[PDB]
Amino acid sequence: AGADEERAETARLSSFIGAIAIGDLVKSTLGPKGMDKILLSSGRDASLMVTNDGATILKNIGVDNPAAKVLVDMSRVQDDEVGDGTTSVTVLAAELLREAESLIAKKIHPQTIIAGWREATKAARQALLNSAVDHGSDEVKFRQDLMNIAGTTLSSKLLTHHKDHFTKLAVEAVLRLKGSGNLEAIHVIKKLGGSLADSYLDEGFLLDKKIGVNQPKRIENAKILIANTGMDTDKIKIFGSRVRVDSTAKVAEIEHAEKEKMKEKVERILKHGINCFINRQLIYNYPEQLFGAAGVMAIEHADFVGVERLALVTGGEIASTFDHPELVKLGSCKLIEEVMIGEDKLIHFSGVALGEACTIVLRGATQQILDEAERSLHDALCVLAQTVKDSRTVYGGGCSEMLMAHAVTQLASRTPGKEAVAMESYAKALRMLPTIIADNAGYDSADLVAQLRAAHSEGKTTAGLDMKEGTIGDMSVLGITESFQVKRQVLLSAAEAAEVILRVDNIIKAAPR
Amino acid sequence: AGADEERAETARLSSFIGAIAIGDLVKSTLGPKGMDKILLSSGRDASLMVTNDGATILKNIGVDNPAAKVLVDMSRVQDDEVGDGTTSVTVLAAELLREAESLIAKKIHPQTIIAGWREATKAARQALLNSAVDHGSDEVKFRQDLMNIAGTTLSSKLLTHHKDHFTKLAVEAVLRLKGSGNLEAIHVIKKLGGSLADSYLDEGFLLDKKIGVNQPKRIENAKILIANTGMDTDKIKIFGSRVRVDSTAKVAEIEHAEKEKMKEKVERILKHGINCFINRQLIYNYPEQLFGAAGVMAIEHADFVGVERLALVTGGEIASTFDHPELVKLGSCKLIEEVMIGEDKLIHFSGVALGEACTIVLRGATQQILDEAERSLHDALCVLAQTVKDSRTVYGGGCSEMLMAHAVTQLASRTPGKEAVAMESYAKALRMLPTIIADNAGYDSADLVAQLRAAHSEGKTTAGLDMKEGTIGDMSVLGITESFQVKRQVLLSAAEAAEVILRVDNIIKAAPR
């Protein structure tokens, strides 16, 4: 914010360079046959993280001075709105900058060209409802639940040999989730034990905390108690001061007063039959001895985020002062256990009556490759949730991109003068995607482009790029699909992201999320 | 002393340089195709200020020694009477200085030449009587409310693709505003999302605070409580002074006394069914636990300005001590809730019975330019208030400037030789405006000048510069008009502001501190 004012040819360059740098790397990550990239960095890193998620690495690091971090930051909101699919939105935005070089020859007002985006809105709209896509998504569904798009998201991913099976699991998770109540209460955690499943579906919530060395091993017909206020007692406001006493015999009454807090907790805890206590904060030591004899399992410093999800699950409770027990607290009673899972001990909450919220647990052999499950897993939750609400999708594998390109070529001749060259340039941008997908397949890129264009022109929406084949094939059999709004938003977002580059001279940061 | 001293050519020149420097930055700003400017300076500035409105930026900063700050100050008096819309008054005054170069081809007394300023008065009258203007815009008004001047103020702003729709909305806001109420209760915030409307009109008030993580999600048949005094207790008007109590046993009573403040609050609260509590200041912790269990949503440290506006809307209240809830307070009861409109959550107050005090919330793409709208809408409220009050307007798009220019050319020849040279210089000043509006359009400036003059001299006031066409067109169809007093004052103000600089010869500065 101190200066570094750049104009026209050089200012354009800073954005232009940012777009080209990002485009080649994200480029290798598209399609069923994606390429893994290894990153090395110093200071609070430790090792090479292999991520083939075009958005995860970009979010993690803001490496340098040029403007692109905000453009990158934006893709996550897109994830919120529709998710990842396969990364492609960033690539299209970068490629319109390529013909900026052609424009120097044009030599008038770059802003005048910006008009083409006003037409770009038309292009976004024309693409919309002309694609001819899938139909159905009835609700729950028997065999269309998955073995489709999640597989596509993971096809580019290394884990597919084992994870194609657990990618399948994710849709079961979405079916329970759907109804009235938004996106809430979804939690999943990694484990180091190995099994031919690589995942377990928990009917309840997974935590990872323990009361202490002593206490009963298992509880039956468990009741749940949640307290806002801590077990600790002493200071308050209007302290009563710091004390000295006349015989050190009265210091004992102070000790006695502590016992009263212990007694209230045990006397009404017993009537309920209390099997487990969960508190989101520090716990006072005296009650700890009490809980072990009673036969009650308590949790010290339980995290608040886990608790809120649990409340929806159990049926909730009204959390206040120690009066909180019995009726003011609602507790589910199926099964609460501390269960050893092949090695690292954890606590399992299960059998929730509500059914609205559930937790997913992962297992594996034990290596860098097994850790990618955490990487892949974040991606799986978002893809499926989007598929239900949009109720619309598009054909993947580049099928969508070639058809649109045929239509846009016509447009450049149509538009007047100055607009026509700029509109034309946007059209040729779509051409690179077919080439990028073919090259990584191990087949000659030049042959692929021509054959691809002929099939899309013909009118078959299903036909697309088949990398294993090396030619063009039927995308629908493959099961590669993209959500409808991913394409709808990218067209509008690319247009509003590219325009800002030429128009604002002074950059840096501050504002909304 | 050692102070800067200048004579003849240099003294005049310092004034001369200040006028030229301002004109180049301001020229981009004028008319339906204006440019956004960002100025950065170090220290006592903090962040980038980009102001579309020319008057606001000049006032703010006194960058250097050369005099121009006083000329700038005059624009604000104009602003109270009318001000904004588009800025053109400053530009015209600056160009009058360029012809002074020709004045050296004379040499003794500029004051006889100064007769031109008197001549300028003659020019002002011609503008004010000629043309046709507009009449009514009498009060409330159904279709003449907007799609006129507000659109034009916005036209110089880039956002006007979807924005012009937003400008149209603002007149409805002024209709409620106007009356004996004066200028009060108007608040506007833009939000993340994507819709064609890009804006929502809220009959109530928009706020951004939360009681805490806990509390009911939505309140229905809401009762609103506003308190002047905080929930904090320990002071009073009579202290009971510094506290030391003979032993530790008594301090227990004091804690219990605190409970009475908690308890009084609940007893009054339950009968009413209180759904929301808003306090302007720090809030004591004990009540916070109470509100959550009850099912009441409270707001901590709410801004006072928002509160006053709300009182007029709800029906008001006598916000005193805890005796405050019930009949002494009036609470509107439609619906108060926390809503995630998109991906950012805010609290919405709506459904006010009174009907006169509304809040406007805007939707945009996701980045600065949208905040530009925050800039523009605030400006908009002032524009509408003046247009109705003035009851006078002129045609926009530079239509006004060319007509006056045709009349002034005759005047130069009409006067005797020396008067004619000075008289013609004022006349040519009007010529640059047609050129300035056309140049930012993206069309060659020279072609535009010849065609424009021919249409105005014909006798058609409505005809003007059409940037969208690339030639000239009918201004009236567009719906672009400028407030009438901007023209009276600029011509009257321009003469004496510039004149004081010339009237003093050989400015000499010396012998100070």
UniProtKB/Swiss-Prot annotation, chains A, B:
Domain of life of the source: Eukaryota
Molecular function terms, GO-annotated: ATP binding; ATP hydrolysis activity; ATP-dependent protein folding chaperone; ubiquitin protein ligase binding; unfolded protein binding
Residues that coordinate or bind ADP: 31, 85-88, 155-156, 397, 482, 487
Protein name per UniProt: T-complex protein 1 subunit beta
Positions of post-translational Phosphothreonine modification: 248
Organism from which the protein derives: Bos taurus
Keyword terms of this UniProt record: Acetylation, ATP-binding, Chaperone, Cytoplasm, Hydrolase, Isopeptide bond, Magnesium, Metal-binding, Nucleotide-binding, Phosphoprotein, Ubl conjugation
Modified residues (N6-acetyllysine): 141, 168
GO biological process, one term: positive regulation of telomere maintenance via telomerase
